[PDB]
Amino acid sequence: RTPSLPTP
Amino acid sequence: RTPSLPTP
Amino acid sequence: GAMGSMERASLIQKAKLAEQAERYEDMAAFMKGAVEKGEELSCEERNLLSVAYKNVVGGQRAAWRVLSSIEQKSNKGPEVREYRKKVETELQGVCDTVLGLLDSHLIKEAGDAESRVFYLKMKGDYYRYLAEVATGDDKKRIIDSARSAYQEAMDISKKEMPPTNPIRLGLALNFSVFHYEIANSPEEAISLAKTTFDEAMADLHTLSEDSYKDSTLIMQLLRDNLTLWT
Amino acid sequence: GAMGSMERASLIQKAKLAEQAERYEDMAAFMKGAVEKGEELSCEERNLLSVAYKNVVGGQRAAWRVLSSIEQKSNKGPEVREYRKKVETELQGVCDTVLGLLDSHLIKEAGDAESRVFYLKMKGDYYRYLAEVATGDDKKRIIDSARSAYQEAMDISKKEMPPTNPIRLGLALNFSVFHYEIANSPEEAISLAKTTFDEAMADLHTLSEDSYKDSTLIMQLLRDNLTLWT
């Protein structure tokens, strides 16, 4: 699946 | 600390 | 209930400790306790809430996918399905908890654009996670709930925040993933990612070095998705 | 109680699924359920029990150390100590659960040397973890409980198993760590590791390729500790 936002 | 046995 | 007797400041302090200890379930419980004190969250506190729950649900989602894949390859007795169901219910429970915090009463009390967009982004993300495991008709209403949250957030962000704002960028990244992975809308996904990237590029000149670093990090993740999708 | 209604075979099947999903808390609960069915465990089942609990307590121990270090550097209010205490109690609880399974009734029903040594090694390891967090006098009795378990295991292993047996090797590795880190006995630690390594080396010629691989892996970990300690 496509990557979404990681943690900062 | 010194390493003990890891999982197999 | 469970954190009702602990000071708000102590909850936040312990959430930070739990983050350092990689105890994300504890972190999430502490931050839920803090939200339930009824006061608005600061910027740092919102980030703690988000980090905590993203780690918890991220573990659950990863486990769900492992189990779902084994289940699909099986198509032995009921065990794989049962255990997949167990993890799925636990995941749905966490999502409902987060959505319940947003609805009681974080979104309604959020007046500043940054806080409101942050919470509506979260609302989209957690309906998106519910969508990943949903089957059939509830699936449609879940998907529309995600879409509606993201769209409201996008409309506020476009009016009130610069194109380089990290929250705005992250929202666009996640909404583009929603389009590609959930809504079966890859062209919308690609469009959104490209337009977001381009509008941010054009505003980089306004940024200090530290802001530039953050904006460009997210821009690189948009580009990475565009590369994967084209 | 909680797994009382599930078939033993289903518990084992689900433990394996939980391992694949990296859901070690679930894995441990499944394996506890399986132990509580009252039958002896096979070799594979013993390994599942051990993997499950090692992962659970390993997370707890890592968190405890992070918190203990912050606490020591603080020497603000009671929060760091409180949260360290919370993690410590949870850890002690897991250790007590494992020790309780060994005592009710895995060790007593274990007649074959391999099973008995396996369980006594576990008993040493979990008293060792309790020792890591203990302070003062209970500390001494905990340390002696670990020592006694390891020593019984060593005596059986020396009489009944080849020097290359992985369980024998692992026991020696962990007992040597006990000596170095817990008992303040670095010379005993070094002696044990060296003698174990040398006696295994001398027996490698007897092994098939697959057994050789396993024995030599552990031998390398003994050597790695000897390197660190000298």
Ligand SMILES: *Cc1ccc(-n2ccnc2-c2ccc(C)cc2)cc1Br
């Ligand atoms: C959803 C969201 C977007 C942005 C941030 N955030 C705030 C400050 N820095 C960031 C950031 C920067 C880079 C990366 C890769 C992620 C996040 C937080 C959040 Br929850």
Ligand SMILES: *Cc1ccc(-n2ccnc2-c2ccc(C)cc2)cc1Br
């Ligand atoms: C305590 C213990 C020792 C050995 C094993 N084990 C069984 C089969 N293979 C192993 C093994 C091999 C290599 C390494 C590095 C670890 C374990 C299990 C256990 Br719980």
